[PDB]
Amino acid sequence: GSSGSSGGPDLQPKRDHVLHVTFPKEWKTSDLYQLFSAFGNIQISWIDDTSAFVSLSQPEQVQIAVNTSKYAESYRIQTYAEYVGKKQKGKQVKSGPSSG
Numbered sequence: 001g002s003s004g005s006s007g008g009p010d011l012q013p014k015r016d017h018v019l020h021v022t023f024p025k026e027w028k029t030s031d032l033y034q035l036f037s038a039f040g041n042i043q044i045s046w047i048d049d050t051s052a053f054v055s056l057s058q059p060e061q062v063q064i065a066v067n068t069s070k071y072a073e074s075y076r077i078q079t080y081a082e083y084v085g086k087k088q089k090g091k092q093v094k095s096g097p098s099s100g
Contacts, residue, residue: 019054019065020083023075035075036065070099 023031032044036054039061045053054077056062062079069077078098085094 015080016059016062017056018080019056019062019077020080021052021054021069021075021077022050023052025049027075039065066098 021032029044032052032054033042036042036044039056043055045055047053054065056065065077066079069075082098
């Protein structure tokens with residue numbers, strides 16, 4: 001319990017490198033790594049039974065990782081902002097440059 005409002009932890013930049021991927025439980029760490037393997041060593045974060053996160057080095061890759069999910073129906077990939085957007089939405093016009 002503490003009073004007053006001060007600073008402390010720095011602020012993190014837009015979560016672009018991160019990608020929200022939702023795959024079926026049937027999947028596994030092998031399916032993820034292997035899939036994204038195209039890029040190389042990555043950090044797969046297990047959130048929920050069907051919720052996972054992906055981390056990349058360069059933003060460019062994002063494009064591809066997104067162009068692949070387009071046709072891919074089994075799984076779905078989207079930008080961190082795009083994903084969260086649904087859950088919470090501040091005050092800023094929204095746009096859907098992708099299916100939807």
